[PDB]
Amino acid sequence: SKRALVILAKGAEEMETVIPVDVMRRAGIKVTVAGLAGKDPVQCSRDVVICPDASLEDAKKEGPYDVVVLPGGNLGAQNLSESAAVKEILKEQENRKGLIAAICAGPTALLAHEIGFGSKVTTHPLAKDKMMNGGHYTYSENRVEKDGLILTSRGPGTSFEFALAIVEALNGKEVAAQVKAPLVLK
């Protein structure tokens, strides 16, 4: 089975966390929800409290992962951006030619850690100016943007598309179609 690391920080957007975790698990991906600050429950941007599967410290020991997923959330992405541990995980994933996926404000952590410079990326419209500071990427308005091993998306309302793009990248178009079928997507 393919494996996914979802890094969960205080202030993460809980929809952008839960939709990818759930959709990936429907696809048969083994997902580890890893708490940035350890194993304790994480208060998300609208106060939903999610209990991680493991601390990031422990989850990094059980890698590598076929995808590292970064949810958004204003404070969540800021916490991801400030973490030396996240920087190392993202640098290693980039070096082993592994997929990195980030949604909404999540891609601004790629900028903070100098990941994937020169990629075509999207973000939430409100995060565009922060992501484009320094001209280190090319911007896209697409709801999901995949440029090689850098996969980005825009908002809670693109989370299903984002998650199914991860599933397609890891498990193929047929598995993604299977998972999509009962979701009643528009």
Side-chain angles (χ1 to χ4, degrees), residues 58-59 61-96 98-136:
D58 286 342
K61 299 173 179 152
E62 300 294 339
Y65 296 85
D66 299 295
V67 63
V68 181
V69 181
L70 308 183
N74 180 31
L75 177 65
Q78 186 174 276
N79 285 323
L80 294 177
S81 293
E82 286 174 1
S83 170
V86 171
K87 188 178 184 337
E88 175 184 73
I89 288 156
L90 293 180
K91 280 285 191 206
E92 296 181 357
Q93 184 78 346
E94 198 180 20
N95 287 156
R96 58 168 306 266
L99 187 61
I100 297 167
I103 184 164
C104 196
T108 67
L110 304 181
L111 168 69
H113 300 312
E114 298 176 41
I115 309 298
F117 280 5
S119 291
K120 189 162 175 197
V121 303
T122 195
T123 70
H124 194 277
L126 295 172
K128 177 185 176 184
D129 281 354
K130 176 174 181 113
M131 184 79 171
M132 289 312 266
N133 186 31
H136 299 298

Side-chain angles (χ1 to χ4, degrees), residues 23 26 160-161 164 167 174-186:
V23 168
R26 286 166 180 255
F160 282 106
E161 293 152 83
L164 288 167
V167 168
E174 191 166 26
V175 169
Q178 292 167 16
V179 170
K180 176 172 177 177
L183 293 182
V184 201
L185 285 174
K186 162 191 299 232

